[model samples]
Target: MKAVGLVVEYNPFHNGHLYHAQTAKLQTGCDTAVAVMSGHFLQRGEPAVVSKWARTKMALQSGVDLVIELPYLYAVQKADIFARGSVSILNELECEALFFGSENGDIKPFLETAQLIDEHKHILNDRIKEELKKGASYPAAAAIAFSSILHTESALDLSKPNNILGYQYVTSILTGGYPMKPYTTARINHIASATSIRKAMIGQNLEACLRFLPAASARELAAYRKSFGLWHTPESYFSYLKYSLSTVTARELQQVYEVEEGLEHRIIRSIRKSSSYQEFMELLKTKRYTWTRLQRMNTHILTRTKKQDMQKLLDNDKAPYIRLLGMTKKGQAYLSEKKKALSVPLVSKLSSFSHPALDLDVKASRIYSLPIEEPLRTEFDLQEYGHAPIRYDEDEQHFLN
Candidate 1:
């Protein structure tokens, strides 16, 4: 049986995601699908609307055959690193295809763009540096330079955050010579964006519920509405933030990875006067260090992820372990047969611990524990299985139609 891989956050599984999964299966003729999903915290440096297990179970219940957790260390970083982590995981899974959703939704353009960038790295890099000198964000600068080198207007619009991620996946596949084909489904307008869905959720817009997600997904979301309120800046974390900044000197903040250009000094000052996470984040944002980058820095501070830790992980080519969040019968059998040959450990539950592999779970649990009140602390370990193997029955079919 063929297997296709997907890298997703699933933040809340919606209609667009359902469509992407179906297209991946049909387009790739793959009998099995595996996904690398973000854990408790997502790329944007906020807690997920739901827990990772809940999200994984949701994927399994929907169309995915297997789900694996993307460790917080990589998941909360920027797009390039995020793509590296995901592509590495998919390559390790030995998947024959990597699938995603894209606004351009065409592989030819991305493939050509990848080839151009790879073949002309110096030209592109120089141009990007020049653009950066002109005060554009790295992403925008890279896009500008890349489009110029490719001599195509197509790539100019492809510079959006998701498209950049898609490009990185393609680049990884090309450079690593990973045996995975690229497949992207057509993008939906408002529904395609995590930002838009988030805004809709915050505004309590039912139209967004009907338009943006499948009925079953909407129902699941509704069920969790009271419990899973939209993520707002948690006021409690501000105290921790203030304490961290106060306790850690500017010299200490400089020690953090991605804290460059004397931005640590700015972060130190911002923390003193800032009243909220938003205020601090805005105060620290610079042309060189984007808002997202600053948020990631704060996350690193919260988790005490040092530069050395990131470098150690980056130097290792192999994925140390894989946590089997949920899997179909075939998936379980496939893994069981290959378990011995696989160098990495496979984790099923909190109780089933292995040394370095279990470290992931411990860190994950600890991170999850830090946020909420006492009663909700253990909620991360709570496994809700009803969401598993996502029931693709008449309910799903009706929603799809």
Candidate 2:
């Protein structure tokens, strides 16, 4: 059976996502659709509004055939590594096509740009260095280099987040020699962006946001709000992070991922002067360090992820296992038929395997679970262990454990 793969966060699986999944299968004419989703944290360096399990169920209900976890190691990185990890998983799964939403529906420009950049990587690197020397952020430096090399204004207008990721996805597929074909669906603004939805949800404007979500996703959001009282956000963990930063030494801060070129000293000084997480972040923000970069770095500090460990994981360049989160009957059959050809272990039970790569995921889950209230907090921990993949029977139109 041919399958089309998606790399998603599905932070709340809105109507736009449902449309993307359905449209992808229609466009590709694939038999099944699979998603590699982020776990507790997202690519933007923030906690997911809901649990991964909840998001998995949301995906299944919305028409996805299978959902797998994108391990924490890759889920929170910059675009290049994020694309590498996600595309590698889909490639390993033997997917025939990869689908993503893009500002421009056509893939021709992305493919052409990727090829041009790859062919002149050495010159591009030199240009990037030159731009960085001018105090530009990494993304800005890379964009300037691409525009200069290609001499096309649109070659690096990655100001649109989806376009940036789409370019990276195509680049990863081509450079890694993955056999997956790339297809894109035109992104529409029928619904508010995730950032807007998040703000609405935080402001208790669920009714206003309801039109942007399918029934299952809206219900899940309502349930989560009722149970947890508030959605998890960076603000939720600010106190913890502030305390962690205040107590850690400059040397210790330097050991965390993305803390380099004397960034640790800046962070240490910021922590001493700023009283709130927002203030600290503002104080640390610079032209060279984007807010998103700082958030990821601070997350590494909060999770105690060392630069050495991140480097080792990247150098290994292999995902330890494929973690199954949810699947339908068709998905189950496909996996059973293709298991022998899979490049990595298909892990359904969390406790059954032990790998250094999985440690960050576990730590992330523990930290994510810390902000929850009472009985649910304890239950969330147990849910991570010995949990079975959620099975959705299309005939019955219901989920089974």
Candidate 3:
């Protein structure tokens, strides 16, 4: 029953993701692969190009045996918290190894770097403070400190996004004392990225993007485009965000998650002057608050997610449930065998759980569904409420017709 775990978004499953999943199983000699993926909004603070269920189906059809939802609470946060949530879920499932794609393509250095950081926390902290005092961003400061303390020139090049996430994932494993082994696959950059794919699709260059995706994923993206219009960006919700920010007082804005140190005042003033979402982001961006951070904060405000609610969930420090999005027969069997030992509830039916965390997930899904058209949109709206994990018969091929 050994399984390899992947923390993914699969925004739209592409060729690179398919390769990653297949390679993970081959490398680990595991019969099953599990993915803990973002639900609706992503870590970068943007709505998923398609619904989570669509993305789940993409993963299941590509090569993954199971896809689980990473609750909105952690999915939309920064790297460390995001890693914490994903790693915790994988650990609970008792995965034998955690596999991820990395630019560096080596896990040993990351593991060693994690141990080094653990052994030199005070020195790292002081170095980080010194860097921050010099106006470096937190991520920049940490990278500088790690490079200095570890003395391994390229040990912690947080500049590369995947490497940063890989570091965080390994750190979470060590800090949580999880038994899962970490592995990394060299990421293929020849294919277009999710960001570039979305841009191509949005720019009406679907053919350009198609080359980078598997046939099934390309078809799925095409179907979604024909039905749901273009994939959404921050500008898609600019008017709504503007209205929300314009109407709310500074005090009210302060109540939103990540709204701190009178940032609400800046947000209030920014919303009034900026005509577009991009302009607003540029206006709000600072060394203290990066664009991604601002995007997450705005998403929280748009969803009416309060700081108190986020704090409550963080304090609890455990996922309310393990939500199955899609699973193969082998995955189902493995879950059935492990059910008795699971620390969190395994929720197949949405009504089976009533936690605040799940509530936020539902809210985020609803927001994600807003830009979609009718009939289909209505169907997507019901996904979180009643949709069951997509199942494939044992003999079925990876790509469903």
Task: Give me the candidate number with maximum lDDT.
Answer: 2
In the range 278-373, model 3's lDDT, one tens digit per residue, is 889988997778889888998998898998899899775556789988887788888888889998889877888688998898888887777666
Q: Which stretches of candidate 1 lie over 4 Å from their true place?
A: 122-148, 154-156, 189-192, 203-211, 215-236, 337-341, 350-361, 379-401
Which candidate comes out best when scored by TM-score? 2
> How many backbone clashes does every candidate have?
4, 0, 0
Model 1, range 275-391, lDDT digits (tens) per residue? 888788778777776766677778777655667667777676656667667775656655666667666666665454454433643564566545556555555335422223222
RMSD of each: 4.8, 2.4, 2.7
List ranges where model 3 is wrong by over 4 Å.
126-147, 374-376, 397-401
Q: What is the C-alpha local distance difference test score of each model?
A: 0.70, 0.84, 0.83
The digit string of per-residue lDDT tens for model 2 on 209-314 reads 8888888888777877776666888877877787788778788888888887688888887877776778988998998778998888888888889988888888
Error of 1 at 154 (Å): 4.7
Q: If both were scored by TM-score, which would come out higher, candidate 1 or candidate 2?
A: 2
In model 1, state the lDDT of residue 80: 72
In terms of lDDT, model 1 sits at 0.70
